[PDB]
Amino acid sequence: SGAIYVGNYRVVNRHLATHNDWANLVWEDSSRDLLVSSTTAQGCDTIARCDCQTGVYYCSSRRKHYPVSFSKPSLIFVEASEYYPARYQSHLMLAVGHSEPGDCGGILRCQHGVVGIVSTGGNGLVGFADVRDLLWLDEE
């Protein structure tokens, strides 16, 4: 699990979204495994606006932060999960690293802020759903 809190937005894995996330839906993209819901409390997270390909992600299954190199956001084929069928995911970044289902929502960050959240795992790769292109997260 895990979320990004920026302004009056909550960003979560679409597959881990709650009924309150869906009842307060702002935006969702099944292709990206992202959902944004509205919050009453102001979020203090900063979204990275950059093209960094290095950063640090939290891995709950190891209670550790790992530094990783990651690919630029791409359309990647992702195998079947306990949450999705084997399909293409857009705006996905891969790194060599440890990712289990419960690691989803772990934040990836660079010097500029939040880059994305863990979304995919397996074959010794971790996929992160990019958020840096969602410029609208940083106003009203």
Ligand X SMILES: Nc1ccc(-c2ncno2)cc1
Q: Collapsing DSSP states into helix, strand and coil, what is residue 40?
A: strand
* Least distance from ligand X to the Cβ atom of residue 19, Å: 4
- 22 lies in the binding site for ligand X (CB under 6 A): yes
Residue 24 DSSP class: T
User: Are 115 and 137 in contact, with CB atoms under 8 Å apart?
Assistant: no
Q: Look up 33 and say whether it is catalytic.
A: yes
- 48 lies in the binding site for Zn ion (CB under 5 A): yes
- 50 lies in the binding site for Zn ion (CB under 5 A): yes
**Between 35 and 126, CB nearer to Zn ion:** 126
Q: Find the binding residues for Zn ion in span 11-40 (CB under 5 A).
A: none
CA distance 87 to 78: 5
CA distance 125 to 68: 11
CA distance 83 to 118: 14
Q: Look up 15 and say whether it is catalytic.
A: yes
Which of ligand X, Zn ion, none does residue 88 bind to, with CB < 5 to 8 Å depending on kind? none
- Residues forming the annotated binding site for Zn(2+)? 50, 52, 110, 112
